[PDB]
Amino acid sequence: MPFPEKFFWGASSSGFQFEMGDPEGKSIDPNTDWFKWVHDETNIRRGVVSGDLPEHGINYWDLFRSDHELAASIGMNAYRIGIEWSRIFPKPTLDVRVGIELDPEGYITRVEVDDKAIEELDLLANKEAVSRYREIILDLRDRGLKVFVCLNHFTLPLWIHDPIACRDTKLKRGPKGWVDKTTILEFAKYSAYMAWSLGNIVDYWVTFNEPMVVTEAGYFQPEVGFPPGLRNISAFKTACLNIANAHVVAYDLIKKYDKVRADDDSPSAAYVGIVHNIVPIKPYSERKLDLKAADLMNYIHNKWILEFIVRGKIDRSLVGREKYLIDKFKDKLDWLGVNYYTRIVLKGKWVPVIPDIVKGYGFNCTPGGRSLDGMPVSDFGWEVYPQGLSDALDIASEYGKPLIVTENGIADSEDNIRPYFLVSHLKVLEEYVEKKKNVYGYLHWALTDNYEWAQGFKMRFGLTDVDLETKERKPRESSEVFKIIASEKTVPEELVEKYPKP
Amino acid sequence: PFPEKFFWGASSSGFQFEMGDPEGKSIDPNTDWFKWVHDETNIRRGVVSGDLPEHGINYWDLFRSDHELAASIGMNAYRIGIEWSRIFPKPTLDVRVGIELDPEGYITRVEVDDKAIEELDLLANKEAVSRYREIILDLRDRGLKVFVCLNHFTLPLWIHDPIACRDTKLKRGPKGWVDKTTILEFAKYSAYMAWSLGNIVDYWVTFNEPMVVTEAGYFQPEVGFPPGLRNISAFKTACLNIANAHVVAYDLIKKYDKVRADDDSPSAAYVGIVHNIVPIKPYSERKLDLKAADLMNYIHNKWILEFIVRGKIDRSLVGREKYLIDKFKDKLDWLGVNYYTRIVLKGKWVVIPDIVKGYGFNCTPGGRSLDGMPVSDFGWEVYPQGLSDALDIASEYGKPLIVTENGIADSEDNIRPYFLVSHLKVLEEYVEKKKNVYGYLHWALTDNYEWAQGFKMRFGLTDVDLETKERKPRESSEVFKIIASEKTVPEELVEKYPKPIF
Ligand SMILES: [Mg+2]
Ligand SMILES: [Mg+2]
């Protein structure tokens, strides 16, 4: 019943949301699509982005040793960080020539990064950024935290994706990001170089964080405020295929250039997974329309990418009307990272059918209010639905890979829901681990407040409050709730009594 | 007796009346006040009541039966508020507009032209516009002269984040009336509403109690208003900006409302302002008490009328400066007078006011004042003679007067009948001797959400049951019916309702 002794307890972070913020300004990375996106005049006036700027952030780039000690002090034994591609290669790697292999239908089944390609990439990489990430990773290991390294977390180098150019011309001029197959080739070089660089201190790799968010938000949901903020159906399907293609070739390249077991316990020297945000879809009724909309949305967001990278089954229509198998894409995943925040309740609409989305549940509730199921609601308007964690893991379990909960958290700047959020969700997780025994860790989002993308700093996810002026960390009560659960390896009934539904 | 076309009616606001729908499809979460009353810190510290506007009386869906109720008791006029946040839930800052700036920094022109209206129409929530159009049309169908208030305290969250302002002491926003851009955006909103509603609306009100917004916002935190700061610098700036916003809105309403909905209206756009006038009684005839009463009367009652009637600007708010802008003179067609009670004060040397307890707004709720008068549930002294004194202060500026608010928090309805009879016989005497008051709007028709106090303060002539939303008229609604329908206070009624012995 208690969580197994080796169960991972930690937090997740990303480069763009954490790193910048130093007082002297020396650590600013202006060379991402997201950096240019949040500084865009038009985006700011329109309310597409918050107007907050990442360069005023919490300064994880220089303060990482303090945050790591904070994480250890509350019983964390694991931690995920993101590497900013734009930091390693501020200037294009397009001139390193590299052998490639193409499937009949056009997919890249192989990017031949050899010794000479590594040498040329070593001459283009920012040695300063590499050594800092090494110092970051080594500080985790020194404090006894197992390191998870994510290679891409939304942001792309500006020479890979200029979102203002893509938006203004509707993808006539670029660089076009994941719409362009060239991005697959460069991401493959970047992945190979990082595995060669850090393979001796990293065993748990992640290629992409929420790749389906990058594509949906970038090309089919402009309301969410992501670059390039278009609604182009063919560009959405192309980016999905390309980013899924990129994972496969990076998976093989990481396996080639990471042959060192940093930890003797690691299941292999290069244990490569993907972080995927799973949303349990709940049909509003058992009517045809509602059931058909739920099935379709579950297929596109939850299942489509996993059929690609685990089964090798490609559906270029994104709606389940086509199946094309590439044997070389089969079983290209070692473990799966499950991000869960809340569910979606949907209706089906006659059009063929299209999701409607019912309000009062899931992602569409009254901020600070109560959902129609009697659950508290975050500052983001998100329903606290702890049972959905079990639903999300059941969907993930279909693909037969070991699971880790890589993100789970709440926007709550005053911390009056987060303790119950931790107690209720970890109760569900504890029973799930004993029952199904295929989940091996819990990574909370996050240790500290950070820059919540298009929402800026006004969404506070941290177990620790951060004063943006002084960069001072002030742990919240929920950090103690986390400490108790992680240290005692169980959810004590005391915590269940003390933190009921607020 | 009152003249034949004397206005008998009531006033209301969007935030205090609209929400309540059980589903509830009408929830407007995008105001500073919505986030303000849902704030757990405010609720925990007693800043706000803990009651939520989503559980209110649902005037948004039930307006037809409330208007029939109003006409049922002899009303011929009704003031409603438009929620800016409902019309423009997303920022309008990218709708570019030419502006003119006085050398002292005041915005003298906001060039809302036809192109600006078209772009604003692309952003407006057409569902909200049509509902307000329905509410106004239903009022006309019952012989109720419509008064439309453009702003009644609440602001869009993209205009004012009161938590960010409070937490950061105005270092992070958006900052509402502290920021001059609010004037520009309010000007665009006023121009759009005149364009869209001008053929059905002739009596316009820019702001309801603007000095209450700034005073309670930036110099009186115990009132419980957002952002709950005390900051005289911000108090001055907000006073100047909201007065600036009235003048430009006045000019743009008259530009885009060229249609006389009623052929006997004074003009196509009769633009007024609703100002709460507090008769200030010095405690004694000493210099200290007289100097403090003069200052208090100047800052609260007179300062903003010096701004928008005479175009005289006082940057200090204490009578130390004098700046004339001819572009600002006579920017007012009529003056709505809100009167609730007086203030008795002393002067203390620091000369600032020292409010004498037992009179006016500072009595023990449900008790007796030191002048022997009944006291509302709010702790407000019932002082009907102050109505004549408040209209005297109003009369100095040479504009037609309408009593736009007058009422009492009295859930048991044991004082309201005397309150009604006594205030209105004072008003009747004033009307025949001064002949410059043309209406009486009671606050309010039904119980509503009384801001920081929630539903505890019941001002309605009609009680409301929040479980079923059922309206239950009080005895005092019959008193109002008799007085309004007979166009005089029958001496029978003065006998029935004398000043109670407690
Ligand atoms: Mg390794
Ligand atoms: Mg008109």
Residue numbers in the entry:
A (entry chain A): 1 to 351, 359 to 509
B (entry chain B): 2 to 351, 360 to 511
Describing publication, verbatim:
The TsBGL crystal belonged to the space group P1211 and diffracted to a resolution of 2.14Å. The asymmetric unit of the crystal structure consisted of two protein molecules. The overall view indicates that TsBGL has a classic (β/α)8-barrel domain structure. The central (β/α)8 barrels consisted of eight parallel β-strands, namely β1 (Phe8-Ser13), β2 (Asn77-Ile83), β3 (Lys146-Asn152), β4 (Asp203-Asn209), β5 (Tyr271-Ile278), β6 (Trp335-Tyr340), β7 (Pro409-Glu414), and β8 (Asn445-His451), surrounded by eight α-helices, namely, α1 (Asn59-Ile74), α2 (Asn126-Arg143), α3 (Lys181-Gly199), α4 (Asn232-Asp258), α5 (Arg287-Asn302), α6 (Pro393-Glu405), α7 (Ile424-Lys444), and α8 (Arg483-Lys496). In TsBGL, Glu210 and Glu414 served as the putative catalytic residues. Glu414 was located at the end of β-strand 7, Glu210 was located behind Asn209, which was the end of β-strand 4, Glu210 is a proton donor, Glu414 is a catalytic nucleophile, and the closest distance between Glu210 and Glu414 was 4.5Å, which matched the catalytic characteristics of GH1 BGLs. The active center of TsBGL was surrounded by aromatic groups and polar residues, including Gln17, His153, Phe154, Asn209, Glu210, Asn339, Tyr341, Glu414, Trp452, Glu459, Trp460, and Phe468. The substitution of either Glu210 or Glu414 with alanine significantly decreased the enzymatic activity. Moreover, TsBGL has approximately 37% of its charged residues involved in ion-pairs, whereas for BGPh, BGTa, and BGSs, 35.2, 41, and 43.2% of its charged residues form ion pairs, respectively. TsBGL exhibited high thermostability, after incubating TsBGL at 85°C for 1.5h, 84% of the activity was retained, and at 90°C, TsBGL retained 47% of its activity for 1.5h.
